[PDB]
């Protein structure tokens, strides 16, 4: 069971400032919601030895903390204590509608970033909704109104290969071997290739970049909280994006 690896105290010590009044999602992201969702994905945080299980949870919280961070340079306990501050994309984001015969934009609905992986666009709400049996295309708001659903979108993303990308799960559990294409692209097993899966097109293969460092900062802090070593190839600075 995933609760044998990550306790409420480990969850809350990682996501220490998420419930400060400054964080608009305060009180949304409960440990119970996370556990309810995580138990629906066999293998999530239950694959390999205890170090592997801890590493997968460390990597998962590392990446999702970046997508939802309310951190800053001079934030209490460091910027890597401010994961999961948000549940909805900041700014005045638009509808994230890209017309699809397969997953149409429900009139009046918006598919901007929601929940721990900031799932975006009607294609992804549709694909995920179909996978987790939730009406996310018609009611994309569920991802910010219901914490179990919110966590389910993020773990769905984590567990699901797409196109030329392995699952984050396969990489995090050491069950991913680079193809010839990946080797030519300098995509090496490690946390950097997880970044590349999530947002490489923007963040990877351009040298030192703030967003990539921030994802690493969270993962290093959580590896320490779990009492494991991060391992190598933490960055995607020299990796060609997948897309």
Author numbering: 79 to 321
Give sentences from the paper.
A class I chitinase from the carnivorous sundew plant Drosera adelae was successfully expressed in the methylotrophic yeast Pichia pastoris and efficiently purified using a chitin affinity column. Enzymatic activity assays revealed that the enzyme showed a specific activity of 235.3 ± 10.2 U·mg−1.
Structural analysis of diffraction data revealed that only the catalytic domain could be resolved in both crystal forms.
